[model samples]
Target: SKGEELFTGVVPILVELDGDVNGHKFSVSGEGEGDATYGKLTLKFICTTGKLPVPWPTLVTTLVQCFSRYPDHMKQHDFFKSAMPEGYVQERTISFKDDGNYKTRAEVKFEGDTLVNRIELKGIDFKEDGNILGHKLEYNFNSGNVYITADKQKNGIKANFKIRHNIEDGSVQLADHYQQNTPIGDGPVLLPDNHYLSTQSALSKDPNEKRDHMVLLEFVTAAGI
Candidate 1:
């Protein structure tokens, strides 16, 4: 199967989530090659069962495609995305249960590329609008503390989770603090927002597809923390 391409070479290492390894330490390292538009990327995942996947571009594309079906899943997906100049190290503690099973501890950190101005984001929270659904996405970012939180309300779909973001730029410092307004539009794929307004378009057959609702396309944010 096609998978994460590590230019520096991927070292497959197994991490035991139970017993002594519950809180024990482990690491994953790999690199990705880029072309003129992009540069090579070295990737690492430290959690129990994540970060071992392919490079960022591949991961991002796959995630976006997945959320296209259920647009509500976009928020949760984008909340966990790992982008350039922004690095993340996640710690997942797993515990064996009485049922002879296991549970994982959750910890996601964002360290922007600013070696001098390092910003670490810890502990994220979220809420779901159980009352309504559509293609809606909202996010808040703090520059002083280097933190961010996002919400996506979907009708006919729902998910709730926390994510951290540490983008390396002045823009990170002025997130959501400004006020803005815009007109609303309609389409086949619906996106629910904080308001009752739906972020979707009127349902219609796409040119490529010969049937109704044949093509369902929704923009999904990259889950980041």
Candidate 2:
């Protein structure tokens, strides 16, 4: 989990759709990271019907794993990945929710990495957010941090929220006021409760076998958010 080992690079991707357009099937292909910090990524979908046929959630989650750090289980799926400074690339044949088959050829290049650009899906012009639904995703990088500032009004209530996560220390800060003028002692504090046992139970496999499991049940009953 060291910072230096985290993988970063340009990611090439291909996503096949479930149906066809005028008897011709559709697929998506692109290469890019989430953002400058590699925290969010957006991939455009291309198809013969000029629309996306696969479920967006299914498509997003499947593609993210090609370069995700959370949910350890995601890395266990069938796929080949490399994250070297020379760049990273992945190739896999994945199944969609509605029985769509996709063959992906993706290349990921980090900052200053060598270029091995390979664009295979062609012969069609693709537009962003055109066909089916598109996806924008967020991730936590252990080597860097993320900063977000937001404001909203709902039901006559005006609210403000700003958050930042220090990946180096795994610390999160959520404030209700502006960053420069955060209210005294109003920023992120401790959990304020001994909910660790409860949290652990929910993440554990056999809560019944451990006292923490029972405590978690009680915590859930109390509706801890």
Candidate 3:
């Protein structure tokens, strides 16, 4: 399998934010290793049974207002770990039309006050250019508040869909959706500016998880100035 060599350990990535926010109970638990499709892996985001684990405060103000109104794909990962901070590497080279290249490595630190983010993705090519999903937002200065981890990944002939969410303060308290054994027709595809709300309203069935796919309201309020 293209010079296959696998030997991973401790990869538990279980994301299932069962639902409800203000009313409580939004879950998160992450683990890591490698083989996230040609890309590497070392991910980590933890917190069990809710109460703000990491980026779960209404998307933590819409992911810090979409990483402050976008700074070119939000500065390409590595949230304040100081370039690799023990282990984080991201590479990219995509000129469109098939000459692709992308990598995202991560390794956040902190053990005293409990703060650790870890990630890895590299040179994806999942059956011809398809792989660049992401998720990881953390900051909890003993409840200075910020939580986000349902993680997101999409790969292949349209069968692997794993999304998780439970927002509040703007609506949608549960979008903890999942579909990956393949075959779930006519249900998933929401796009009218909401930018595929994670495969259409987080896999529809009465899930309008409302919008904010990382805040694009005319680039945050300037609204056509």
Candidate 4:
């Protein structure tokens, strides 16, 4: 990948700055191989049905119950998730300017439907705004593991929950929950297989309040920003 990818793409030329009045005229004419995780980066969220549908507070318990208890059953479903609903939430993309130490600005949010039967589960409506610095938004040949920090920027995340069970007495259960001013941290994104700049939301900072709602990101990279 590193070798084949090296000589295939070309660097960008003619980047104009038109705004703030003066229309600062600019142009460029160059050629080189010094761009990785550079230029405009898009961060998206992936929510699939039967993937991870649980309330924010009960996520920890739900995860432990799902895997630790029925590893075989859960593992089986995970592999054969071909007939489930794929939640490709709305893309709230932002242009980031990534390399060694990138610019600190990004705004990404996700949305989709995750309703089953008559039971309405939670849906992601979270937001990650500003401070998408490439401090560690680093990229590698095949892929890279990095952290995109966020601070000196606003983080208005929302994870609304609505639960109802149609079993036993649960047949008459219902509720709604949509929070505000939620914070985001950890920022560990993986440049996954094929071409996915995968990003997940670490719902709560504290492990005890572990609402680790993962929203996968399928991304496309622009040659230049």
For each candidate, how many residue pairs have backbone atoms clashing (under 3 Å)?
34, 10, 8, 0
Better candidate by lDDT, 3 or 4: 3
Q: Name the lDDT value of residue 19 in candidate 2.
A: 32
Per-candidate Cα lDDT values, in order, are 0.20, 0.27, 0.23, 0.19
Taking all chains together, each candidate's TM-score versus the true structure is 0.19, 0.28, 0.20, 0.17
Segments in model 3 whose C-alpha atoms lie over 4 Å from true places: 1-20, 35-37, 42-47, 50-82, 86-107, 110-115, 118-225
The stretch of ten residues in a row with the least summed lDDT in candidate 2 is: 214-223
The pairs that clash in candidate 2 are 9-109, 9-110, 10-108, 10-109, 12-106, 34-40, 34-41, 51-131, 52-132, 88-108
Best by the lDDT measure: 2
Task: Give the Cα RMSD of candidate 2.
Answer: 22.7
Q: Which stretches of candidate 1 lie over 4 Å from their true place?
A: 1-78, 81-100, 114-225
Query: Model 2: per-residue lDDT, tens digit, 9-118?
Result: 44443333243322345454433333212323344433334544332322332233223322233222112122233333333343322223334444433344322233
Q: Answer with 1 or 2, whichever has the higher TM-score.
A: 2
Candidate achieving higher TM-score, 3 or 4: 3
Scanning candidate 1 in windows of ten residues, the lowest lDDT window is 58-67
Question: Candidate 4 at residue 77, lDDT?
Answer: 19
Better of 1 and 3 by lDDT: 3
Candidate 4, after superposition: displacement of residue 94 in Å? 31
From the highest lDDT down, the ranking of the candidates is 2, 3, 1, 4
